């Protein structure tokens with residue numbers, strides 16, 4: 424598979440290798456804040472990242488992933504819409520060529536400069552590869568980024584990026600604390616959806632925080648210096664690695680806040 428984000432291999436093409444692209448629970452979606460309803464049944468959200476163990480950062484040709492040790496229940500997400508325990512495995516971002524675009528989810532059609540995805544898998548399925556075959560296998564915590572003040576907790580990420588410029592490069596990335604990427608409020612929207620890249624599997628409970636984090640123009644500029652290509656290959660900047668909003672179909676987006 425040679426999927427990507429360009430004219431020739433971008434999201435409009437994905438359905439030919441991955442027919443579930445046109446499925447019933449695809450992501451991302453536009454969150455219409457006037458149609459989403461507060462749900463009193465939602466339990467409180469629990470982000471337990473105190474014991475998180477980051478290992479490595481990888482340019483996979485699509486984004487850069489900060490990977491965690493998920494061989495035990497270190498860093499977990501529970502509560503909210505979730506039943507049981509979801510283990511953090513990695514986070515990554517999606518971003519734009521310009522500050523006016525980059526997020527996958529939109530809020531009343533508003534696009535943010537970037538979107539952070541903290542990816543967790545349901546431990547009742549034993550491993551990640553089994554979890555992605557299940558409708559409740561993953562929980563993705565999505566956090567919007569807007570450009571304003573710098574986010575100090577992001578700068579360690581920004582600073583390692585020149586060591587992983589091209590596809591297939593990785594670097595040791597230990598002792599990174601993902602709590603420094605969260606906004607103050609855990610108010611969220613939630614809906615059932617999918618992975619936003621191939622294989623597009625319909626295995627995600629999406630939890631999208633309402634409060635964006637602010638990052639600096641300089642910080643997001645450094646994201647845009649990465650490359651989609653491998654070393655020695657013609658330079659294609661890693662920008663606009665986002666899928667546009669997909670049809671909501673027969674889904675309701677629920678708000679955790681009144």
Ligand SMILES: COc1ccc([C@H]2OC(=O)NC2=O)c(OC)c1
Nearest residue numbers: 540542563617618619620621622
């Ligand atoms: C193999 O693991 C994967 C594969 C794809 C995705 C995509 O879905 C998404 O929301 N962003 C993505 O890059 C993922 O993240 C949950 C994890």
Ligand code: NA
Nearest residue numbers: 455456531532
């Ligand atoms: Na709207």
Ligand SMILES: [Zn+2]
Nearest residue numbers: 515517540619
């Ligand atoms: Zn993502």
